[PDB]
């Protein structure tokens, strides 16, 4: 209605909303905690959701981190609306759940409210020797067969904060390009 229409016909150019999802124990909350450079020890599995509003390259990034515990996944959709970028986090060492991680990601991509989102995949926990390579994870999840969304896979280690920023920088640029593209076709036709 009036209230929600008002909100988007009013968001400022450089406010972006990012939804971070993934299986429980993937390291979602560790990752955004590291972004601010908040300490990340004493982190507990999320039963609800965390909101952390950022600042990066002139952008205010409002990041929503939703618990990935299985009994919670049906509520993920209450957070789909107004997502400029979807961040899918993966525990690279969690080899036995790669299929479910795959199933979960796939159902998100046919979701209508997520039609526009840029997809960033964080193959987290690369610091673990049992961690599958990004390529192996790209193979599983069958990312190469996604043409509905722009995506990229970034191997990282939230615990050390290694490679998180390059992931985010790719995501912001892709989001910017999409908006740029839309504006282009709007003013011309």
């Amino acid at each position: 209605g009036l209230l929600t229409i008002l909100k988007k016909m009013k968001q400022k150019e450089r406010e972006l909303r990012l939804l971070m999802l993934g299986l429980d124990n993937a390291g979602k909350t560790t990752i955004l905690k590291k972004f601010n450079g908040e300490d990340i020890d004493t982190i507990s599995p999320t039963l609800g959701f965390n909101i952390k509003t950022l600042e990066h390259r002139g952008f205010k990034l409002n990041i929503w981190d939703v618990g990935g515990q299985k009994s919670l996944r049906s509520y993920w959709r209450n957070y789909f609306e107004s997502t400029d970028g979807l961040i899918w986090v993966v525990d690279s060492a969690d080899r036995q759940r790669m299929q479910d991680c795959q199933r979960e990601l796939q159902s998100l991509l046919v979701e209508e409210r997520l039609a526009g989102a840029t997809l960033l995949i964080f193959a987290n926990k690369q610091d673990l020797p049992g961690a599958l390579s990004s390529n192996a994870i790209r193979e599983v999840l069958e990312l190469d067969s996604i043409r509905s969304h722009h995506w990229c896979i970034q191997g990282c280690s939230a615990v050390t904060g290694e490679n998180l920023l390059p992931g985010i920088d790719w995501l912001l640029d892709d989001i910017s390009s999409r908006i740029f593209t839309a504006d282009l076709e709007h003013h011309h036709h």
Partner: protein
Amino acid sequence: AEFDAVVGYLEDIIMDDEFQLLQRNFMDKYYLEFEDTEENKLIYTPIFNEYISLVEKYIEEQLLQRIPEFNMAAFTTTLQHHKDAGDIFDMLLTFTDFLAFKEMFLDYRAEKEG
């Protein structure tokens, strides 16, 4: 237009205090589901969406007590387009900010405790 008139009533409806009572009576039903922690509960969301629907609906009702032929969509469409904004829309935006909504709720809870 008939527009500038509605913009006037909004200020009158929300900055009235039947509205503030509406808000309190809503919070009375849920205030103790709200915890003072940084992590939010999933249940805050449906309550939040219920709140938004309630405010939006109290509006349209009060607005047609004014102009009995007020069509929300017509005003919204005409707004969601070519009369594009102000000073009270800023308070209107307030209702959709989840973080402030939560704080509104938290201050209320502490108040109710005592």
